[PDB]
Amino acid sequence: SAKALIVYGSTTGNTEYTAETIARELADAGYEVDSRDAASVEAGGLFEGFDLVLLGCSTWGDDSIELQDDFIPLFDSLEETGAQGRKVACFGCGDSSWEYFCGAVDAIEEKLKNLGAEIVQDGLCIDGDPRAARDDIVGWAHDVRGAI
Ligand SMILES: Cc1cc2nc3c(=O)[nH]c(=O)nc-3n(C[C@H](O)[C@H](O)[C@H](O)COP(=O)(O)O)c2cc1C
């Protein structure tokens, strides 16, 4: 079967829950899903062997757009991950009280495109408690699968 990698940076658990929800959706559809906390990964060759890569990251920063801390090293070395020609999609939790709502997702997408990835679906941005967005999360995973 096709193999999917999900890597998530999450501090309060929201993007982690989102990743777990996406993983079950893909696994139910027949994907072999490898889900990893970004804190545990190294960037070099990270995407090797994977037909689909899903990257999740929350947004931070006192008065700038900053990526979740565990994701920053992966972003900083994203050019070594094997993203060229890779089918990728991005997701993240945020808070719409911030103007740059899920700004980290946008930043990861833009760099992926420079690096030659194929963005298979527009990034998923979740407001507030992601358990109150379960339908949106499952639907997005479904749409990602249908777009590859
Ligand atoms: C200092 C600070 C800055 C934040 N900045 C943003 C932001 O710019 N855009 C956004 O969408 N959310 C912002 N947030 C909201 C967090 O991303 C939100 O709490 C999210 O649910 C955390 O997801 P996680 O538990 O997966 O880490 C900010 C939160 C804090 C504390």
Author numbering: 1 to 148
Q: What's the publication's text?
A:
Previous studies showed that proper introduction of disulfide bonds could stabilize the flexible region of target proteins and reduce the conformational entropy by locking the protein into single desired conformation. Here we developed a comprehensive disulfide bond prediction algorithm that not just increased the success rate of predictions but also improved the quality of crystallized target proteins. The theoretical and experimental results both indicated that with relatively lower values of conformational entropy, proteins would be more stable and readily crystallized to higher diffraction resolution.
The continued disulfide omitted electron densities of the side chains suggested that the disulfide bonds are successfully formed in all crystallized mutants, which are T9C-A36C, A20C-Q25C, V16C-A29C, and K27C-A79C in BRIL and N14C-C93, A43C-L74C, and C102-R125C in Flavodoxin, respectively. The WT and disulfide engineered Flavodoxin structures were determined to high-resolution of 1.20–1.55 Å with B-factors in the range of 16.15–19.24 Å2.
